[PDB]
Amino acid sequence: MTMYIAFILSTIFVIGFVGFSSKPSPIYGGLGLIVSGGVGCGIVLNFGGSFLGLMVFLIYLGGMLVVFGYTTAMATGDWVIYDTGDSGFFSEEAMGIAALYSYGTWLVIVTGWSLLIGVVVIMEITRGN
Amino acid sequence: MNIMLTLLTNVTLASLLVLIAFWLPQLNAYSEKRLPFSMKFFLVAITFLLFDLEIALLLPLPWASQTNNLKTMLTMALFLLILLAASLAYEWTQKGLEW
Amino acid sequence: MWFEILPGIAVMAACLFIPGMATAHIHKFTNGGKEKRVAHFSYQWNLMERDRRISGVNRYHVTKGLENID
Amino acid sequence: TYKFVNMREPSMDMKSVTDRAAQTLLWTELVRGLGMTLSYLFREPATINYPFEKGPLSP
Amino acid sequence: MFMINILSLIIPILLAVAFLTLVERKVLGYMQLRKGPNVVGPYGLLQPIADALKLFTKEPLRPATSSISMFIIAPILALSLALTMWVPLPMPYPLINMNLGVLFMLAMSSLAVYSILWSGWASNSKYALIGALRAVAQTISYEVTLAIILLSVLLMNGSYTLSTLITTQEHIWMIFTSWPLAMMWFISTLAETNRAPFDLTAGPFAMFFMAEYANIIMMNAFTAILFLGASHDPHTPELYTINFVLKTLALTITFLWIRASYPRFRYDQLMHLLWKSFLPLTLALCMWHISLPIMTASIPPQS
Amino acid sequence: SRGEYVVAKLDDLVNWARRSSLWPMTFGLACCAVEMMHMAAPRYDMDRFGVVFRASPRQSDVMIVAGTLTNKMAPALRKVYDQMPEPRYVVSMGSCANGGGYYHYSYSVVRGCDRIVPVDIYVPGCPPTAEALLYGILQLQRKIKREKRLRIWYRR
Amino acid sequence: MPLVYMNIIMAFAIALAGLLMYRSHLMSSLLCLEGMMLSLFIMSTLIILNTHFTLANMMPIILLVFAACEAALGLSLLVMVSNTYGTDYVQNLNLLQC
Amino acid sequence: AGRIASFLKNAWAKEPVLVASFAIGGLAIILPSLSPYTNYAIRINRATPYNYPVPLRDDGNMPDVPSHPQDPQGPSLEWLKNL
Amino acid sequence: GVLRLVMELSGEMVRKCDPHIGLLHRGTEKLIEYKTYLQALPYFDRLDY
């Protein structure tokens, strides 16, 4: 038992949150948030959420924090609550995520409409005049 | 475990080699002698973020092909791609892709 | 001539050869002369665990045949 | 006398339009330039082995 | 013996990228009716060694006003990501076997822009900042279509597992199934690494340089695995290794050829290229590759 | 003893490394730049000696002054020279750069580039042939081979 | 409710407090909001994976997408404010008052 | 009809990429509803056993339920083999 | 050759472009007046080289 690896990752997560919550030099706050996001991705991956952790690490880190840094640059106890059996010959997380197209028709519709409306809203706001 | 060790080895080797590169020529003695904020780049970044979100929506497709409800998933995936194309077309026709 | 570029390409080829061959050799060496067992999907992981518990030496690749069924 | 260098009229028949579309979509001229460079690689270079070989001169 | 495997993966990549610089000057020189380096070493073979020695001995020009932190962090991240990209790949067997290997590579490539951003910001110059912003915008723009093309291609594979690509291409290459996607993927890998016609932009410089060439070779390996699948025999993986390495070498020589053959784009021209020619075709082909396995009843097995 | 042997061998290694890869930046002021480019032509192929074509001033090892240096231009040349990493050399190419040349008695011409920067090699001619400039580069390589930095540091 | 959930809730509370402080730099406000949504993502993902509730594996993706869209909207608003005043300082938004 | 033909011929020139994109997208939308193999794909997805088939308690009133896997009763996969 | 180019840019577009010359002004025309015609001939080789 690696001295509660989940606990250590959680403390690193909280320390990073205190680090960028002081709000020093927004580029440094963004660096702290990047470290915190990496630690959270590590927590999720070590828990067993491979695809969701990879979604964090790809989408969040590489798109949203990258755009944040781009805009800034323009300016000036565990192991016990776990399961017992196996999953079959597949991962339940992947099946539940893929059920979005067979079960979550309503969710897909509303999310796509929201994304299109967001594109339109960004255009209208950034017109200026 | 193995992935952690591999990442640690990569980081350690990179750090060691960069530091020796930065310190080997530091031992010998030598002389030792704005505003614009272009709006188009921000629009490019925001468009990238939105398209990345829609791609993230498109990512579970390889597993969605085994659902026994093939018609519904095909309709929903085509709907998502059609709205992606519609977003691209709207930003094209509103002079949002010009320089 | 153009074949004077070949020595550098050959050096590159050997350098790129090393990783795959080394990995395959290490996999055969550390897995009892066979391919490393792959475990996705959590069922063949259970197969590997049962093999390890059956071997008696705490190694999954030590295969127990029909001779061990008495 | 004088010549025209860029005074051509592209043909607007269906076959010519399809040929130009195929050129646009399949990058034929880019491949042709690649072939020119590839062919030009397989010919002897003009380099001399200075200082063991010297450039020609005159009295 | 895992550390031995890690080292035998890392060191040969650096040697390969060290000798890739010598092969680039030779191929270009011979395409220009001249020779490459053929004096330092029997056939320029010591040229890479000489360059490395000179670079590690030359004075580093620290700006004396820049932020040292990001200045030192950027090459570390660049080289670490460049070396990490190699681990997932199966040649035929991966050092680390990942279920979502392709997704992992996509995430690493997404991170790769932070080195550019931090180097541009810490340079303490407005013009360098403009160049860094321009490069970052180009990189994210092209990684969009990289991701879309990659998922469209994987729709015929059945999963994100990289080893399954060998099984998928057991009888026929993926190049014949979808060549237009391969064309756009190759051009996008050109644009990702800032290679001509998209090259619009001592120690740390050496580190950054090594990272770029390692990324080039890794892109070539990923492309060769994805689109030109070699046959793998379980009782003799050396054949697969040889075929894969030969295909990667051919693709890298193809980048050098393309560099020697063409002029370069303008920035607005490459943005227009992507956003108005690659993205619509990529979306149409993504729809087509979603529909095709259902139409032909050829859905891949794994789920 | 071994103390001088090790520093001598390391000095030879460093000199070989430094002279086997010379990265020049060229001030193409005037028609001597034409012969400079002809030395990069396929016939002479400066690249085959390890001398790259048009290196950046930030990672350049030797400055080649090829053309007339005017009074209006001298501050920029000095500024570029100052921004070079320490192991740097200067090659003066052509009569104009060597001593002012055919414009020596002019009100707007610097009478030799050595009024502004120190010079290691003087290449004579108007213009020197690309082969003459190659000879000058090889002479600079031999001069770099001749130097001894670790020996001096050891005997001091 | 074990200690990992408490740590993530503490991270959320710290991010909320940092948002509500406003030393300056509205960009830091957006950063605090994104830290809050990241904490929400992590803790909801842990809850969903622990209980083997298969069908909510969708929900973290939806949350991430919507929150990133909100982030883009906030970034656009910040850019407009900065173009109006030349800086993203909080105290420059004092034209409207109670 | 002439206007549409003229528009298509004018779009095929100076805009081939958009014409190809729209053609491919429209074909991808339309063809799946006309192909007869989509039902084959659905049936193949039906025949992939991910779960254990739990047996039923026999009460003498299930002639359609086989008692052994080799029994002729039950669904067949000869059609899949012939494919 | 060598050129100093001072320009005003609005975003990507070039608003104004003002070239600064004289970095290779050797005073050839004044030097020619102190030579004979044959002596002044070689300056024209160096004019447009």
Ligand SMILES: CCCCCCCCCCCCCCCCC[C@@H](O)O[C@H](CO[C@H](O)CCCCCCCCCCCCCCC)COP(=O)(O)OCC[N+](C)(C)C
């Ligand atoms: C009734 C009033 C209609 C007019 C008012 C409309 C109000 C706004 C429009 C949004 C409402 C649209 C209704 C869709 C509800 C989703 C559920 C329904 O469609 O059934 C689904 C069937 O899916 C349909 O194919 C969805 C087709 C509709 C989507 C295509 C176009 C959507 C456009 C709607 C507006 C969005 C923006 C505008 C775009 C132009 C379920 O599939 P099924 O397999 O049985 O069950 C799944 C559960 N399993 C897995 C256990 C079996």
Ligand SMILES: CCCCCCCCCCCCCCCCC[C@@H](O)O[C@H](CO[C@H](O)CCCCCCCCCCCCCCC)COP(=O)(O)OCC[N+](C)(C)C
């Ligand atoms: C694995 C650990 C690495 C640690 C760091 C070391 C880096 C790698 C070591 C390899 C370096 C390669 C050295 C080889 C240089 C010899 C080149 C030889 O061909 O040059 C000849 C010999 O020149 C010199 O005499 C050779 C000096 C090299 C030094 C000798 C051995 C040094 C090894 C000491 C290593 C200890 C390192 C300890 C600190 C890390 C003459 O050529 P040159 O005159 O140019 O060109 C004339 C052109 N012509 C012929 C056409 C007319």
Ligand SMILES: CCCCCCCC/C=C\CCCCCCCC(=O)O[C@H](COC(=O)CCCCCCC/C=C/CCCCCCCC)COP(=O)(O)OCCN
């Ligand atoms: C019934 C079944 C039908 C199924 C559908 C299949 C139909 C497919 C038919 C068409 C597909 C072709 C698409 C392939 C990619 C097309 C992209 C394209 O055409 O864009 C070009 C641009 O493309 C380029 O020029 C990129 C070249 C950049 C230089 C790089 C050199 C590349 C050449 C070397 C060959 C590359 C080899 C690729 C294969 C790699 C193998 C892994 C348009 O630009 P413009 O000419 O300026 O016009 C638009 C403005 N009016």
Ligand SMILES: CCCCCCCC/C=C\CCCCCCCC(=O)O[C@H](COC(=O)CCCCCCC/C=C/CCCCCCCC)COP(=O)(O)OCCN
């Ligand atoms: C019904 C299917 C829907 C889904 C498929 C589409 C998937 C992806 C395609 C959509 C991407 C977004 C499209 C954006 C549209 C932009 C329109 C536009 O503004 O373009 C015009 C130019 O192009 C136009 O004229 C507008 C569209 C022209 C018509 C395009 C084709 C229309 C239909 C052709 C195919 C019909 C069906 C195919 C049958 C073929 C037989 C098999 C302006 O271009 P500029 O950048 O300003 O350059 C001009 C300066 N030189």
Ligand code: SF4
């Ligand atoms: S040195 Fe001679 S050849 Fe060179 S620019 Fe001056 S006059 Fe011309």
